[PDB]
Symmetry: C3
Subunit: 75 residues, 3 copies
Amino acid sequence: YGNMTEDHVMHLLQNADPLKVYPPLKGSFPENLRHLKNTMETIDWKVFESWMHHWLLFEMSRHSLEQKPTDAPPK
Amino acid sequence: YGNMTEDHVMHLLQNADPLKVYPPLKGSFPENLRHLKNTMETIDWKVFESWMHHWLLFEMSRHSLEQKPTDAPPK
Amino acid sequence: YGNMTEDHVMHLLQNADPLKVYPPLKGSFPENLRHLKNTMETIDWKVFESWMHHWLLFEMSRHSLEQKPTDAPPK
């Protein structure tokens, strides 16, 4: 679905909750994450980290592509 | 990984919890979201909104592609 | 953004929290999920399932592509 969704998802969050913020993470993703962490609510970061962790598992669990080979035959 | 995952993720949610639902969001994404919100548990929506917010940060923080230029030289 | 993000997101989780783990879900996604579930904290799984459920809604709500046709005319 490409993008054009964060502004539509952000707005869906900017109207459902007046406390939803998305600070400009202009740094890099590891800065943008530590910034959201060092900036957003530590607890929203707690949850965001868990969101990234779930995001991580999911992608890992659903990474059927990357699969190491093994031993087909017995000997 | 394309799609073919929501039915496999939905099933992973339809078996782990008998209270997991995914109402037909036939409207548009902003209707589908307000529907999940106006339909799903406000608290599941609270969490979903936070999920969209985390989903949003992540994508924003990890959006190394979109980067505004600046001033390389001092003068 | 392709991938090269789970290791950067995992690290963002491996430094923010010393209890963040991502067990090798070498099985399939439905095994990797039931493994994270049967392995990770049931409560982290509770949240991960909710993360997959939110991940699911979002993708479904934002699936403007898949749209069944209807009746344009009245008769």
